[PDB]
Amino acid sequence: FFTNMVDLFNTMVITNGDEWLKKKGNMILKLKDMLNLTLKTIKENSFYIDHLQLNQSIAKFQALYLRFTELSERDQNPLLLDFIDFSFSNGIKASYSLKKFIFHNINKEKQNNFINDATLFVLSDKLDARIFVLKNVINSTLIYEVATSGSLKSYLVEDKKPKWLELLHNKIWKNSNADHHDLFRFELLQLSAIFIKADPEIIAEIKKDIIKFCWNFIKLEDTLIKQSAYLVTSYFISKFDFPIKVVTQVFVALLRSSHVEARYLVKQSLDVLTPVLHERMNAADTWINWVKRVMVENSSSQNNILYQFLISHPDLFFNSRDLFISNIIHHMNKITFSDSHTLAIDLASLILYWENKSLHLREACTAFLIRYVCASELGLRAINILSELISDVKLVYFEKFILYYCMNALDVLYVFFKNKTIMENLPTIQNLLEKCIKDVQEALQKVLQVIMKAIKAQGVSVIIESPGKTFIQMLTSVITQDLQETSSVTAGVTLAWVLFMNFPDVPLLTPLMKTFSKLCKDHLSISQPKDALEEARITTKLLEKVLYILSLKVSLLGDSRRPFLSTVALLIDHSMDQNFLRKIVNMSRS
Amino acid sequence: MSLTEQIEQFASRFRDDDTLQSRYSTLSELYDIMELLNSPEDYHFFLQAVIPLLLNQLKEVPISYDAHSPEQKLRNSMLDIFNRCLMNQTFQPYAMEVLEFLLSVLPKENEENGILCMKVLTTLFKSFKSILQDKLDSFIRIIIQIYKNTPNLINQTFLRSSMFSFKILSECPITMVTLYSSYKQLTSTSLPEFTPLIMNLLNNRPAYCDFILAQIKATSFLAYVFIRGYAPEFLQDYVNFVPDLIIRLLQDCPSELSSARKELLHATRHILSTNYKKLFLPKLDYLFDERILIGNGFTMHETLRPLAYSTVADFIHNIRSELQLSEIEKTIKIYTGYLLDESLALTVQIMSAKLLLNLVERILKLGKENPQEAPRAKKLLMIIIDSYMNRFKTLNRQYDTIMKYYGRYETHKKEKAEKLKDKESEEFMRKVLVEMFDIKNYAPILLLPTPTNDPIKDAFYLYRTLMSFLKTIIHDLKVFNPPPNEYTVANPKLWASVSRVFSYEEVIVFKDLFHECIIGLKFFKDTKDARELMDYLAFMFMQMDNATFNEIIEQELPFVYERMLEDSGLLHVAQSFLTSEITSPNFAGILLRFLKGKLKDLGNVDFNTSNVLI
């Protein structure tokens, strides 16, 4: 009967428009008690408790009362009473009320009338949830006013009382006993978040008095709130004027981290202070020395180091004890022995920034960058800034350094490409390159392409000149002729193409006439279906595409140019090569 | 490196005391002993100098009892090298030189002591308990020495045991008794006597706090050992105290710090990691003592709420051995309420789902029972859906509540994806030729910063598994069907082979699901896998009773057809529901009616709406 009448009311409420009590609803009182009276007998009985038969009907009157709340105009009293009746049993937390609050929030002095009513209602402490949800409304009201304005301007442009400061100085003086769900801390964080909101306002010393109560909150320390009050302090400190002894101690408080790291605040507190103290350091360095002792007092904390990574951007702009920081950094490089690398990348860049505007440690820095690759990004590019820094362990301490060989293939390539900027070193490097002859060959093609940029001369044509070219090229032919070295042939072709890019001279062409022959064999092997999975075609596409590209490119389609077009007809038998022959005509048309 | 630096250091430190530089040079050498630039193997050389220099130190600053201003600063000079080393080589020889110094500082413990020594003691115990070379019995004797000095310093005078780390020889044939002295002390006696006063007064709240905080920090480390004597060690004839001691550990926890709970949690996880203690305790314990008052404290501990619940989730998941109906009723209400508490964590929610679905099997297993118990079990089965309906129907509509604002998230999810992002051939041719908590995010006070996710892929996993556990739920629903001969059913196999009854509420529950999920299906930006998920939702609703399947479809059809005007994947949903050769005679009847209106108004529809109708 508790349910069935309510829909019997609701179906009548459905039919009637204003209401069938015409937006007055004395039975709404007779029901709202009856539900608590249903909640009364609910405490006696246990048949089908927490029934949806209740719970849906429980939503229904909740929907109904919220509808009348929108329908009525008394925009103070049912707000608490519903929150009271919802604190009474089975807390709904109506998103519709959150929507109606969003409908209520987004000057209406009805909001200001609610605002002192809010100052009343949450101070009307009598449950905790009733007080808590009020604060949830209150902070959201506080936030949306200042957020959806220039700066809180419905209140900031003459809120027609210090109704806040009536409540605020009352609260700031109170601090009463500094709530199972950290509701005090929730009320504190609400008090904190409200005070964070009003910190851009017109209260200077009363806020500095309110921040003094926040120092009592900073005196309060349970771990979340402790950093939070530390976070609360910094936003005051960026805003308000700061004593230097308070400035160092807060930086000392910044030096005191914890377990569940409020680094987000700590970076933000750094984002407060690293302007302010450095501007004050610009306005004047004793704080950094006290910091350096504190930095010494890190006790293995790399949280200090990542904080110091931000702090080194003023500090390398300061540029006081750079190698001392770097000597710490190598001991920190020893400590991680990819987070430290970025810190090392920043610290290298910081050291690079001052010196552009020891090298052995920079050489040891490259040793860690290689060792970071060998125990497996930016670190290639960080070696390239290190390349521009070390050209502002020599080359030979990696005779043993698969993936390690390939990573060193990339590394020695950038090592060679940078240190090139030679004519004896490169065959001596080719002596090392002939030694380390263990795709990685595609990376070796990139190294050869780096060697090809070195093979560019600009005034060295028949000046002494090509043993390194010939020894590779026969080794390109010999590796090709064995078995399955198609990409290796192509690399040797790309070598020969680089050699043709280097030289106007047939001995390449005779394996190359053998190559497009063997590719034509490989074409008919690959066009044995008239359509494998993906790779060997597209390679031999690009393999023959390069193989086509050179054999025409100079001149003089050979004496077996008759064998040359015989592949081309079998190519026309295949179904591909749209642009490729289209270019290949165009030069032959030329 | 026991070199010209180290020679110049000890020479300038000629006198062992001097002024501030004497403190400063004391710290910096230990700091390089920790963290110099390089290390050319001076550690065995320096420790050969150090264990004497520590004997020179332990002579100079001997004992406990507040040797404060330079001498604990000398103990701070002592602490700074007390561990600043690494047990790499020649460890055992100087260790015997340290074992002399270790027994030397073994007593002195109370009234501003325990700082320099424990830092040395861990550096010794790590090098000791890596091995089991039996010099650690002298440490255990040194331990039991201070473990008399401690109840003297505590229980009369009204710290940092690491007893499992002390007993990290990983065998323990040396008995529990030394810890079992403290174990039976802290457990079988209420280690504070204010605690029987306060626990009776409940049903550190007074100012006598740091003592209870001491007695908590004691019993926490006392618990910390007890799993290393429970997990690799089986005790005998000590079984009545341990649930009560668990109830005692349940009774007390202070909440200033946080790893207090966190260790005690992972302890209780290890305490849950036992097997017979898992087999005994919840059958014996009213685990409702582990209420929301099990996990209480800061909103820091809201981050601790998962593993708190997840272990409690792991608890009943293990303890799923015939939990009684009213007990299962609390199990449903709490955990599905915890599952309803969807603002915590999806993984927590998805886990709590799989708890309940496994619990549904237990509800199925124990619910297969008395015909006296069957309608309450059917009411439990009604409660099961009443969980299940409201489970998704909140959360999916909560998800649907998110879906509007998720366009702004899509405005971000694309935006971060927006922020994320043949010269041999060519050049040779060349020179040779916010009305929600989005505004609450917009506030400068924030705990964690704003994360990022593929929310649909978040939602699809949310939608899959929740529909997945929904799919078996209705599959099990053909068991508590009423005797259909009340309706005089000529096919008693066919009735109760599928759904046979529901409440008018439960129908209204069921009809909401399609009213949810179809409107729920809107989040698919510009798939067919979701259509296969939609098929699963149809395959779910395929397992239903026909009159309901008729009646809900009636409510579905305009809500279908109006929403069908949005996009065409609903036709695949229609293609699903017809093509099953059971739902075909039903779904003909509605659409035959439901088209039969609109044919007259085929005159002027959109070409979409034509093709939609067509």
Residue numbers in the entry:
A (entry chain T): 1665 to 1770, 1775 to 1794, 1796 to 1847, 1855 to 1960, 1964 to 2016, 2022 to 2041, 2089 to 2107, 2115 to 2130, ...
B (entry chain T): 1 to 18, 20 to 159, 214 to 258, 287 to 504, 511 to 522, 558 to 650, 676 to 763
What does the paper say about this structure?
The structure of SAGA was determined by single-particle cryo-EM analysis at a resolution up to 6.9 Å. The overall shape of SAGA resembles an open padlock, and can be divided into lobes A and B. Finally, the cryo-EM map of lobe A was reconstructed at 4.6 Å at FSC = 0.143. Tra1 is composed of HEAT (Finger, N-clasp, Ring, and C-clasp), FAT, FRB, PI3K/PI4K, and FATC domains from the N- to the C-terminus. We eventually generated an alanine-substituted structure of Tra1 consisting of alanine, glycine, and proline residues. Tra1 functions as a base to organize other subunits in lobe B of SAGA. Structural comparison of free Tra1 with its complex state revealed only regional conformational adjustments upon SAGA assembly, which reflects the structural rigidity of the solenoid fold of Tra1. In addition, the elongated ridge surface formed by FAT, PI3K/PI4K, C-Clasp, and Ring-C of Tra1 constitutes the major contact interface with lobe B.
In Saccharomyces cerevisiae, the 1.8-MDa coactivator SAGA (Spt–Ada–Gcn5–acetyltransferase) complex was reported to be required for genome-wide transcription by RNA Pol II, and proposed to function as a general cofactor. Yeast SAGA is composed of 19 subunits, which are categorized into four modules, namely HAT (Gcn5, Ada2, Ada3, and Sgf29), DUB (Ubp8, Sgf11, Sgf73, and Sus1), TAF (Taf5, Taf6, Taf9, Taf10, and Taf12), and SPT (Tra1, Ada1, Spt3, Spt7, Spt8, and Spt20). The largest SAGA component Tra1 (3744 residues) in the SPT module was shown to directly interact with the acidic activation domain of TFs, such as VP16, GCN4, Gal4, and HAP44, which help recruit SAGA to promoter regions of target genes.
